[PDB]
Amino acid sequence: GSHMNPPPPETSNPNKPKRQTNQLQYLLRVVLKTLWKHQFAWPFQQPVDAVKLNLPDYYKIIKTPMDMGTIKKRLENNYYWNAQECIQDFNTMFTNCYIYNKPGDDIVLMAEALEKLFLQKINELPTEE
Ligand SMILES: O=c1cc(Br)cc[nH]1
Ligand SMILES: O=c1cc(Br)cc[nH]1
């Protein structure tokens, strides 16, 4: 991709600790699966390509980018140690969108629909066993 977009967030790193948990399995099998097929998921399925979108200031503003494509790879590659790390990635993705864009913009309404779905599923995140 373009040299003007940063490398994506890390999805593989042998030095970082990781494990499976039933909560992480739920995040992949229920949470990510639900959000990924939503009508409004598509803009969130890969890193923001600020060159293609003509958003030259994006990576000046957003210093902790995150997207569902990255979260999917982190879940499928067992990158995480715990659910909190993955929930934080989702929350970063939503808050980036709300910080960068005007309230009421289409992309914000899209993120808000995904976040509504997310919160319902996270309220049912299973007890860690
Ligand atoms: O303008 C934009 C586009 C995306 Br995708 C995410 C946040 N802001
Ligand atoms: O401005 C935008 C950009 C994308 Br990508 C999706 C919705 N609105």
Short mmCIF file of C-alpha atoms and ligand atoms in Angstrom, two decimals:
data_model
loop_
_atom_site.label_atom_id
_atom_site.label_comp_id
_atom_site.label_asym_id
_atom_site.label_seq_id
_atom_site.Cartn_x
_atom_site.Cartn_y
_atom_site.Cartn_z
CA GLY A 1 0.00 0.00 0.00
CA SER A 2 0.97 3.68 -0.05
CA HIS A 3 3.96 4.89 1.94
CA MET A 4 1.77 7.72 3.22
CA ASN A 5 -0.38 5.31 5.26
CA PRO A 6 1.25 3.83 8.40
CA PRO A 7 1.85 0.09 8.80
CA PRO A 8 -1.28 -1.54 10.22
CA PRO A 9 -1.43 -2.45 13.89
CA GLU A 10 0.57 -5.52 14.88
CA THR A 11 -1.30 -8.90 14.32
CA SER A 12 1.61 -11.30 14.93
CA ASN A 13 4.45 -11.02 17.42
CA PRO A 14 6.12 -14.07 19.00
CA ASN A 15 7.30 -12.03 21.94
CA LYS A 16 3.88 -11.03 23.16
CA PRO A 17 1.97 -13.25 25.52
CA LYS A 18 -1.24 -14.76 24.44
CA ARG A 19 -3.72 -17.41 25.37
CA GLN A 20 -7.10 -18.72 24.51
CA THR A 21 -9.99 -17.94 26.79
CA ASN A 22 -13.70 -18.73 26.49
CA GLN A 23 -14.28 -14.96 26.46
CA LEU A 24 -11.94 -14.48 23.49
CA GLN A 25 -13.71 -17.39 21.70
CA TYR A 26 -17.01 -15.57 22.25
CA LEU A 27 -15.51 -12.35 20.91
CA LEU A 28 -14.66 -14.11 17.67
CA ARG A 29 -17.62 -16.48 17.29
CA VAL A 30 -20.40 -14.14 18.48
CA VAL A 31 -19.20 -10.53 18.64
CA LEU A 32 -16.96 -10.13 15.59
CA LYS A 33 -19.21 -12.45 13.54
CA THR A 34 -22.32 -10.33 14.38
CA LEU A 35 -20.64 -6.98 13.64
CA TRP A 36 -18.84 -8.10 10.48
CA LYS A 37 -22.11 -8.96 8.65
CA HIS A 38 -23.90 -5.77 9.61
CA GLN A 39 -25.07 -3.61 6.62
CA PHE A 40 -22.79 -0.80 7.90
CA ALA A 41 -19.64 -2.83 8.67
CA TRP A 42 -17.81 -2.36 5.36
CA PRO A 43 -15.93 0.88 6.15
CA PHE A 44 -14.57 -0.74 9.31
CA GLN A 45 -13.35 -4.00 7.75
CA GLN A 46 -9.83 -2.71 6.95
CA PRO A 47 -7.51 0.10 8.09
CA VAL A 48 -8.48 3.59 7.01
CA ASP A 49 -6.72 4.28 3.67
CA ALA A 50 -6.28 8.01 4.12
CA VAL A 51 -4.72 8.39 0.64
CA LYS A 52 -7.60 6.76 -1.18
CA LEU A 53 -10.19 8.68 0.95
CA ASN A 54 -8.33 12.02 0.62
CA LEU A 55 -8.04 12.45 4.38
CA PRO A 56 -4.43 13.70 4.53
CA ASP A 57 -4.76 14.79 8.17
CA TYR A 58 -6.22 11.43 9.36
CA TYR A 59 -3.04 9.95 10.80
CA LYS A 60 -2.10 13.37 12.22
CA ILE A 61 -5.28 13.23 14.38
CA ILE A 62 -5.75 9.49 14.94
CA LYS A 63 -2.61 8.18 16.57
CA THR A 64 -4.08 4.78 17.69
CA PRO A 65 -5.82 3.47 14.55
CA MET A 66 -7.87 0.31 14.79
CA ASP A 67 -10.27 -1.57 12.48
CA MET A 68 -12.22 -4.80 12.47
CA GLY A 69 -9.96 -6.41 9.89
CA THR A 70 -7.11 -6.07 12.36
CA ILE A 71 -9.27 -7.29 15.24
CA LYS A 72 -10.37 -10.32 13.16
CA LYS A 73 -6.77 -11.26 12.43
CA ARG A 74 -5.80 -10.73 16.11
CA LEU A 75 -8.64 -13.07 17.17
CA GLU A 76 -7.98 -15.70 14.46
CA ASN A 77 -4.22 -15.65 15.15
CA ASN A 78 -4.62 -15.74 18.93
CA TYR A 79 -2.82 -12.45 19.54
CA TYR A 80 -4.62 -11.49 22.73
CA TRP A 81 -4.06 -12.41 26.33
CA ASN A 82 -7.52 -11.44 27.54
CA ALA A 83 -10.92 -10.12 26.48
CA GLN A 84 -10.14 -6.64 27.77
CA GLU A 85 -7.41 -6.17 25.18
CA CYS A 86 -9.84 -7.03 22.37
CA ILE A 87 -12.71 -4.96 23.82
CA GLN A 88 -10.32 -2.04 24.01
CA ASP A 89 -9.54 -2.45 20.29
CA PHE A 90 -13.25 -2.26 19.44
CA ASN A 91 -13.68 0.77 21.68
CA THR A 92 -10.67 2.47 20.09
CA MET A 93 -12.14 1.90 16.63
CA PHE A 94 -15.46 3.50 17.62
CA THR A 95 -13.93 6.42 19.47
CA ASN A 96 -11.53 7.17 16.60
CA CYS A 97 -14.50 7.55 14.31
CA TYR A 98 -16.35 9.79 16.76
CA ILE A 99 -13.26 12.00 17.31
CA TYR A 100 -12.33 12.40 13.67
CA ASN A 101 -15.78 12.92 12.12
CA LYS A 102 -18.66 15.36 12.75
CA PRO A 103 -21.60 14.03 14.84
CA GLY A 104 -24.32 12.98 12.56
CA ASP A 105 -21.96 12.24 9.57
CA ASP A 106 -22.80 9.00 7.78
CA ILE A 107 -19.71 7.22 8.99
CA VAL A 108 -20.58 8.14 12.62
CA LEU A 109 -24.15 6.81 12.23
CA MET A 110 -22.60 3.62 10.81
CA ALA A 111 -20.21 3.27 13.75
CA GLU A 112 -22.99 3.97 16.21
CA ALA A 113 -25.10 1.14 14.77
CA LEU A 114 -22.18 -1.25 15.16
CA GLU A 115 -21.51 0.01 18.68
CA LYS A 116 -25.10 -0.56 19.72
CA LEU A 117 -24.83 -4.15 18.56
CA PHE A 118 -21.42 -4.48 20.27
CA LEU A 119 -22.69 -3.31 23.65
CA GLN A 120 -25.59 -5.75 23.59
CA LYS A 121 -23.20 -8.61 22.91
CA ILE A 122 -20.59 -7.51 25.44
CA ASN A 123 -23.22 -7.29 28.20
CA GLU A 124 -23.54 -11.07 27.64
CA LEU A 125 -19.80 -11.82 27.53
CA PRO A 126 -19.62 -15.12 29.43
CA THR A 127 -18.08 -15.56 32.80
CA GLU A 128 -14.42 -16.51 32.34
CA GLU A 129 -14.00 -20.23 32.96
O1 LIG B 1 -13.74 9.95 7.59
C1 LIG B 1 -13.62 8.84 8.18
C2 LIG B 1 -13.61 7.61 7.53
C3 LIG B 1 -13.50 6.47 8.27
BR1 LIG B 1 -13.52 4.81 7.36
C4 LIG B 1 -13.41 6.49 9.64
C5 LIG B 1 -13.41 7.66 10.30
N1 LIG B 1 -13.49 8.80 9.56
O1 LIG B 2 -17.60 9.65 4.08
C1 LIG B 2 -17.77 8.41 4.17
C2 LIG B 2 -16.76 7.46 3.89
C3 LIG B 2 -17.03 6.12 4.02
BR1 LIG B 2 -15.64 4.90 3.60
C4 LIG B 2 -18.28 5.67 4.40
C5 LIG B 2 -19.25 6.58 4.66
N1 LIG B 2 -18.99 7.91 4.55
#
